[PDB]
Amino acid sequence: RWIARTFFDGPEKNYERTMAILQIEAEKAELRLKELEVRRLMRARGDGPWFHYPTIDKELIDHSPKATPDN
């Protein structure tokens, strides 16, 4: 009789801790099933800036009437 309430508890702490730390899982094992959804299969679209590769900067073009009309 004087062992439990001196030391520990029953189905009020070790239950609903199982219900507690098993809600840190469905936002962990499911976001890890979105990286494979997105990173490996992005793929040919390249919409989200992960496969964004630099090509050229069009700022350095010129527009003056350069001295040959047919160029």
Binding site: E27, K28, D47
Partner: protein, 57 residues
């Protein structure tokens, strides 16, 4: 009765007159084409933190 154009000639870029239609929509100018959309969003921190293997925080 003509002029001796000493130095004023062959310089001083002018304008002439509007004679013909200006060729807008030039030689081909096919497309841009379209860009890809961006994200503005809202910078929140990590949802539970770094989610790597066990790695709580």
């Amino acid at each position: 009765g003509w002029v001796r154009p000493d130095l004023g000639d062959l310089s001083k870029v002018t304008k002439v007159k509007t004679d013909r239609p200006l060729p807008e929509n030039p030689y081909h100018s096919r497309a841009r084409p379209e860009p890809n959309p961006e994200v503005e969003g809202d910078l929140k921190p990590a949802r539970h933190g770094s989610r790597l293997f066990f790695w709580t925080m």
